[model samples]
Target: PIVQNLQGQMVHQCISPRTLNAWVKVVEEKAFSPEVIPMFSALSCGATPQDLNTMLNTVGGHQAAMQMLKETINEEAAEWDRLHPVHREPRGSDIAGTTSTLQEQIGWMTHNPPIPVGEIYKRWIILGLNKIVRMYSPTSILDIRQGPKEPFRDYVDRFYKTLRAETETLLVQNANPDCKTILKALGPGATLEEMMTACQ
Candidate 1:
């Protein structure tokens, strides 16, 4: 029996020698080159030595090897998803594609998947949310200003609310939010407390 630490837990690994050979063959046939050993070791765990011995060893393989590694990928994808915003169509004042990229990847592969499924999902979501930001982002500081068309307080609320709703995860992480932008656009005279009240 092969023992390995999976997600911080040590457990016995069980896989038929034949199935083990099949996975090794998958790696060899796919020709991952220099990255193969690391990829394989990651998918299999640290049980195998990081050397030529890894290629010859049979102790680390398991039937659910790929399945287990997939959990780690899913965990990352969930984090990326939380930061990613959903796509919304924009009108002049307020806001509301073809086959989804996600579905296409699924239909293309059913077994022995060439790419990690969670990675694909994460990539598409990032792409979609990124598109929304590029297209709908404010063109000028005045665009986010409280004009005669709307009350100052309501405008501020909408500004931050829209910002949190749309760009909180990505843009909000690094760049200043709309409320900050409004304050910045207000120039040096505005106090931090005043900025807070203006936005509230």
Candidate 2:
């Protein structure tokens, strides 16, 4: 995926390491901001805060939080081959790391110094994967009952094949040894053409 700003300058061409890091950083920063948090919060339009808390809990919580968390897990599931993002799930030791990092930064709010929501979503996917995304809606389930049904195992296997092909293509494109690492370097007086030549 090539990212273009409003001006259409090639701000990023995905799959490159620079773009990869940039994409991950963007997810870490912008996607989890408080402004963006509401979108992911348990207090979204349909679900109340209590609903959210219950859904997110494994042993207990509301039905909707369960829904949100389940949605997060489904998107990152092994079946989807969405793995890179799943490895960062925060837990016990991770809390210590978070506290340490926040201690050094000014204006860091301990209660909600921005969560690694990305990691939470990531780990949710890794753990829940196919187990989540269960739908019992009459429309959805009825539609499935009426429609042709493929075996779950076969469906997942085929999906993984397609996933592998797409990833392989991107990896090959990014693997060229001469890829211009310099143009990607930060600071002023940099030209995009110089970076393009480096990729050759």
Candidate 3:
């Protein structure tokens, strides 16, 4: 459960109502582009089938993240299908059954999945961070280190901590392994939400 705290929050819950609809709109508009943009992965599947196979076999791989994503896709697809009275195209629900089923499809060597599932995890982290930052510093472009009442270093330190806390909350709640990776790279307790949010 990587999104443990986040999923329960009122603000976090707000994201859900719009999540699938937004994704559907993007997919419908052909607005999705797959590339590594900062903290976000443009493609759902970041690597080739061989790469995914390698990742699945790697120790401490993002298996949990993948599984959670499968669940998200399945849920999102269902939600979209339910909301959409008319089908302009196939919803995700039509393509797969349960989240685990989606994972099985992606893992299948013969399938050659077009999108990297783990990328969504990365994008979600990025968005979460962006939301937190905006709440505290609405106008800052995430560049200014000094705050109105704090020293540059102190402010930056606090910023990172806040971000780390948020990311940790999301990772623990959502069941994402990448959260650990991002946190470790930052420091023992550094916030990684801003880094993830850079995807937008």
Tell me the whole-model lDDT of each prediction, alpha carbons only. Answer: 0.39, 0.33, 0.36
Q: Candidate 3 residues 88-181, lDDT tens each?
A: 1334443332233433333432234433333333334334334433343433323423333443335445555545333334432322244334
lDDT of 2: 0.33
lDDT of 1 by residue, 98-126 (tens): 12232333322222443333234333333
Candidate with top TM-score is 3
Model 2 sits at a Cα RMSD from the real structure of: 20.6
| Model 3 global lDDT (CA atoms, 0 to 1) | 0.36
**Candidate 1, superposed: residue stretches over 4 Å from native:** 1-116, 136-141, 148-150, 161-200
- Evaluate residue 116 in candidate 3 and report its C-alpha lDDT on the 0 to 100 scale: 33
Per-candidate TM equals: 0.25, 0.19, 0.28
Give per-residue CA lDDT, model 2, range 1-200, as digits (tens): 22336984423222334433443444345432223233333222222222222223422323553465455544444333433343533332222222233222111211255444334433443343223323211122111211124333343334333342223223223322333133235234545344334433
Q: Residue 151 in candidate 1 has what lDDT? A: 44
Better of 2 and 3 by lDDT: 3
